[model samples]
Target: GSHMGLYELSASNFELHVAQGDHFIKFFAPWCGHCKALAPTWEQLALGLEHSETVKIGKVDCTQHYELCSGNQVRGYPTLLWFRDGKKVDQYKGKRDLESLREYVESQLQR
Candidate 1:
């Protein structure tokens, strides 16, 4: 099954919170054109990874939690943050194709 949720991550709780599992999260704004374009791609990726034990996909609305964006030093829309054990191990900024997204996730899974 697909599990979807939103988590507002700040520097204070980022590592402590995400350290519980591997999570793929998007930082985006509803008004961002790039975010709109990437929404489907993210959903597709989430669905594809639904059965994976190492993946939990989610998103944070930058518009609703601007403090998260600011405190986390997120400079742009559609920022993909990869978290494992409550620490950000990697990230991909900007829009990404489905294949690239999958590849990124797979690479993370092997870590």
Candidate 2:
């Protein structure tokens, strides 16, 4: 399910990237069917981005990075954790299709 350009964010360097801001991290488990379904979709969202300079897509495999999602904060599969200026700014609850996901970033770039 891994793809180029999409970072394999691990516990060790997770903080490093988020601190840079414009980071969109997806917290998922390898066994979750919904997470599996969202993998390619998320990939497309990365590939379809209009401007890579303003965003970076990464995935934190909760199965391996247990400490990354040790609480209810990431209880759901394919959790979209949007960060800006090292702060968790918001989340995307809309349909996880390519269009919606890409458009979500568009809205973020607005303000």
Candidate 3:
């Protein structure tokens, strides 16, 4: 309900957070049904790793920040990107479930 422990990211603070450490950023549009569906799982993943210092979970409203999402080449309604050391390292294209998301993020943290 509270977005678990995920950070609400905006264009203004996107770069600042990325510069800090590893980030699992979800670029989503308000009108996208798929994004809404995946929201719960995303929240769970964030909550599961709320105390992890190696990585942070964040989300951006692509509809409100079109330029920021477009600049990052986000063509889809819900795009998941993993950033490490202020640069994008990979794109997540896996199952949108608690365990799947957790494993993926944990693997990234390990790397």
Candidate 4:
């Protein structure tokens, strides 16, 4: 069974923890309209990717971690960050459907 955990980020832990994992780091702000709209879609993507070994899907609330988000240059809500080998190799802004999200993760895993 898969478990969903919401990650909290800080300046010291953001890069070291999030940037260093083979995972999909979803940055979301609780109050953003777009972020709210994306909630369900994000959940769907998370559930779909639960069994994939190439990536560990998770989420981060930017509102609670303002400095971390600012430091990482997160200009918008619901930013999708892909980290591998302790580095950010890919990202997406705005909204993404489940299929698009799945395809992106799978492509990264194959690389």
Candidate 5:
């Protein structure tokens, strides 16, 4: 039940971490317009869902991990992908708002 639910993911450890649990990751570049716009919402999402033991929230700094982002088919600044036990099973293609993201994560964990 805290902001501790959020994490910073990178190339070396991203796969290992995601493989361990259900993970929702936002791949973003710090300088991107949309990435900055969605930053606070992403934070709120983390705060809102910090209680659950089954799900985890994380983000990747694409600028620092270009190869990792590229290898994942991240063609844009902010790409939100959902992973379950290591593999990408879903993605967020809708609006990047708190309620929407909150609901998206909540609903998906029904898995």
Candidate 6:
């Protein structure tokens, strides 16, 4: 189960979540090796930021929700986007490590 507080998002709730507040959302394909490799790091990031009132961590399985991913112009296996006030601020393209993700979230919160 998702005990680490990471929100598993889909087309049904994607818009609502993004509209709520600062969100670090990842669009991923389950079959992709990179996505699978990054799962653990994502979990740690989610857990670390679970109590933050200004940010939330979420993920979408692109394999199951192609329209949602395609609508977002997600052309990669693992695309990380930062959303604030229902709009996309930017895409994350840095190192995919626990500390990097943590720092990224912190930086977003600071904005």
Taking the tens digit of each residue's C-alpha lDDT, what string does model 2 give over 1-111?
557668888888887777874877789998899998888888877776534787888888898988877642787787888888777778678888888887887788765
Provide the lDDT at 60 for model 6.
Answer: 90
- What's model 6's overall lDDT? 0.87
- Please list the C-alpha lDDT of all candidates, in the order they appear: 0.75, 0.80, 0.85, 0.71, 0.84, 0.87
Give the clashing residue pairs of candidate 1, or none. Answer: 18-86, 19-85, 19-86
lDDT of 1 at 57: 79
Identify the candidate with maximal TM-score. 6
- Model 1, 8-32: lDDT tens per residue? 4554565566778788889988889
Clashing pairs in 6: none
lDDT of 1 at 36: 91
The pairs that clash in candidate 3 are none
Ranking according to TM-score, highest score first:
6, 3, 5, 2, 1, 4
Q: Which ten residues in a row have the lowest lDDT in candidate 2?
A: 45-54
Evaluated with lDDT, which candidate comes out highest?
Answer: 6
**Which pairs clash (backbone N, Cα, C closer than 3 Å) in model 5?**
none
What is residue 43's positional error in candidate 2, in angstroms? Answer: 1.1
TM-score of each: 0.79, 0.89, 0.92, 0.78, 0.90, 0.94
**Position 4, candidate 6: lDDT:** 77
